[PDB]
C-alpha cells in the first residue's frame, strides 16, 4: 500500500525534474513501476483480512487509505491501462495533464475518507476542461458539459459529507455510521447518478469521449466511470442502504430506462466513438442495479463486469483512434472494405466487438451471468427485462460491422508495429479473464 501511494506521488514528481526530452521514456518507466507496485500491493494483501486487506493512515482522517475487493480490482485496472495512455500521448503539456489526472484518480480509489475522496477526485476538473477543449481537435461545449455536470454532482456529495461529519463527527468509512435521511442519501446518490452515466444525466459522457484524445478516452472509459462503483460500495451502501431499499422501484425504473434509451440512442449514431460511448452508458446500468440489490452476488458481479468493461471498451476506443489516425475520419459511411484493407485491425476489432456483445469466451459473459443471476435473485422479471433488450445492442453492433466490412476502397489503412504493441496487453488480459481468471 505504502509503496503504491509513494509511486503514485512519484510519477507527477518526476516530470518536474526530467529533461523535457526524456519525458516520454521516464513516464513510461514510471507507469510500469506503478503497475509493479500495484502487483506488490496485491501480494501483500492477505485474504485472511476479510474486511480490509490493508489500511494506512498518515496522520489524519483525510490521509486514511485502504484497499478492499472493489478498490483493489479498480486500482489494478487503472495501473494496467495507464501505460497504453502514456505511449499514445505526445508532448510535455499532455503528459503533465494525463499524469496529474491519473494520480488524482488512483488516489481517489484507495481513499477511505469521503471528503478526501471528493478533494482528490475533483482535482481533475480543469484538467479535463483544458484537455477536452484543446486548441484544434477539442470542443469547448463538451468541456463545459463535463465540468458543470461534475461540479454540481460533486457539490451535492460534498454537502452530504458535511452533514455526516457534523452529525456523526466522522466521515471515514472505517467508522460504522448509519443514516435514514433521504436528503443526505440523495446528496450522495446524485454523484453516482451523474458519474455513472444514467439517463437523463448521461449527456456529458458522449461529447467528452468524442472530443477527448485517445488516451483521454481510454482513461475516461476505463476507470473514471468505475469510480462510481467505488463510491457506491465504499461510501453509499454501508451508510445509505435503507434509502436504496426504500427507493428500489425508482432505482430500477431509472436503470432500466437508461439501458433501453441508451440502446436506442446508439442506433442513431454515425460516429464510431459515439457508438462506443453509448455502448458504455447501456453497460453501466446493469452494474448500478446489480450493486443496488445489496447482495453478495450483486457486488461481486458489478465489480467483475466493471473489470470486463475496463478491458473491452478501452480496446475499442484504441482501435478507433488507430483507424482515425490512418484515415482522418470517424464516419462509418466513409469507412468501407476494412476487412480486405486492414485484416489485422479487422480481426481485433471483431474480437473486441464480440466482447462488447458478451459472447461466452469473453469476460463480459461471466460478468453478465453473475449480474443477471443477482437480478433474478431479486425478481425474475428484473432479469427478463434486461435480457430481452440486450438484442438492441446486437442490431447496432451488427449494422456497424456490416457497414465497415465490405465495399470498394482504394486505401490500405492497416495498423503499424506500434499500434499492435499498444493493444497486445489488452487482448491477452481479455483472453485470460475470459477463460475464468477474473
Amino acid at each position: 500500500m505504502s509503496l503504491y501511494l509513494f509511486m503514485l506521488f512519484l510519477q507527477p514528481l518526476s516530470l518536474s525534474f526530467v529533461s523535457r526530452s526524456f519525458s516520454k521514456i521516464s513516464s513510461l518507466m514510471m507507469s510500469f513501476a506503478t503497475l509493479w507496485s500495484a502487483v506488490y500491493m496485491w501480494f501483500t494483501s492477505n485474504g485472511a483480512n476479510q474486511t480490509f486487506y490493508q489500511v494506512v493512515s498518515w496522520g489524519s482522517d483525510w490521509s486514511t487509505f485502504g484497499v478492499c475487493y472493489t478498490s483493489l480490482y479498480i486500482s489494478l485496472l487503472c495501473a494496467f491501462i495507464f501505460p497504453i495512455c502514456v505511449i499514445l500521448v505526445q508532448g510535455y503539456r499532455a503528459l503533465s495533464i494525463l499524469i496529474c489526472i491519473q494520480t488524482a484518480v488512483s488516489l481517489s480509489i484507495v481513499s477511505l475518507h469521503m471528503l478526501a475522496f471528493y478533494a482528490l477526485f475533483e482535482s481533475s476538473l480543469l484538467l479535463f476542461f483544458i484537455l477536452i477543449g484543446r486548441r484544434k481537435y477539442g470542443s469547448l461545449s463538451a468541456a463545459y458539459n463535463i465540468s458543470i455536470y461534475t461540479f454540481i454532482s460533486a457539490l451535492g456529495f460534498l454537502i452530504s459529507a458535511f452533514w455526516l461529519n457534523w452529525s456523526f463527527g466522522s466521515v471515514c468509512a472505517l467508522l460504522p455510521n448509519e443514516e435514514a435521511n433521504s436528503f443526505v442519501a440523495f446528496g450522495i446518490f446524485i454523484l453516482l447518478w451523474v458519474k455513472a452515466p444514467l439517463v437523463p444525466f448521461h449527456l456529458w459522457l458522449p461529447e467528452a469521449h468524442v472530443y477527448a484524445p485517445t488516451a483521454g478516452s481510454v482513461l475516461l472509459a476505463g476507470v473514471l466511470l468505475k469510480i462510481s462503483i467505488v463510491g457506491l460500495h465504499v461510501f453509499f451502501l454501508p451508510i445509505c442502504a435503507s434509502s436504496i431499499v426504500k427507493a428500489f422501484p425508482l432505482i430500477l425504473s431509472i436503470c432500466l430506462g437508461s439501458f433501453i434509451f441508451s440502446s436506442f440512442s446508439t442506433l442513431k449514431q454515425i460516429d464510431l466513438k459515439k457508438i462506443v460511448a453509448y455502448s458504455s452508458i447501456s453497460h453501466m446500468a446493469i452494474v448500478f442495479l446489480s450493486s443496488a440489490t445489496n447482495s453478495g452476488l450483486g457486488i461481486q458481479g458489478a465489480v467483475l463486469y466493471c473489470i470486463a468493461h475496463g478491458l473491452i471498451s478501452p480496446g475499442l476506443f484504441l482501435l478507433v483512434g488507430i483507424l482515425y489516425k490512418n484515415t482522418n475520419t470517424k464516419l462509418v459511411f466513409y469507412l468501407r472494405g476494412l476487412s480486405q484493407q486492414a485484416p489485422v485491425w479487422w480481426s481485433v476489432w471483431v474480437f473486441f466487438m464480440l466482447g462488447n456483445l458478451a459472447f461466452p469466451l469473453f469476460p463480459n459473459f461471466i460478468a453478465e451471468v453473475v449480474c443477471l443471476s443477482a437480478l433474478f435473485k431479486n425478481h425474475e422479471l428484473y432479469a427478463y427485462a434486461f435480457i430481452f433488450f440486450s438484442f438492441v445492442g446486437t442490431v447496432y453492433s451488427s449494422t456497424v460491422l456490416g457497414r465497415l466490412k465490405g465495399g470498394v476502397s482504394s486505401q490500405c489503412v492497416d495498423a503499424s508495429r506500434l499500434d499492435v504493441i499498444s493493444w497486445n496487453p489488452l487482448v491477452l488480459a481479455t483472453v485470460v479473464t475470459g477463460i475464468g481468471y477474473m
Binding site: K325, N326, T327, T329, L331, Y334
Partner: protein, 42 residues
C-alpha cells in the same frame, strides 16, 4: 511523384523541401465528400 518517408534503419528525416510527395500517414486519408460533410453537420 511519391517517395517513402519511413526508414526502418532509424535514419528517418522529413523532406519538407522534397519535390516528391512523401508517403506519410496522410497518404491513406479518405478523400471526403461535400454533401456527406453537410449531412454530418445537419
Amino acid at each position: 511523384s511519391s517517395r517513402i518517408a519511413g526508414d526502418t534503419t532509424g535514419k528517418y528525416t522529413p523532406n519538407i523541401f522534397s519535390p516528391e510527395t512523401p508517403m506519410d500517414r496522410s497518404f491513406s486519408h479518405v478523400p471526403k465528400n461535400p454533401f456527406w460533410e453537410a449531412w454530418v453537420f445537419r
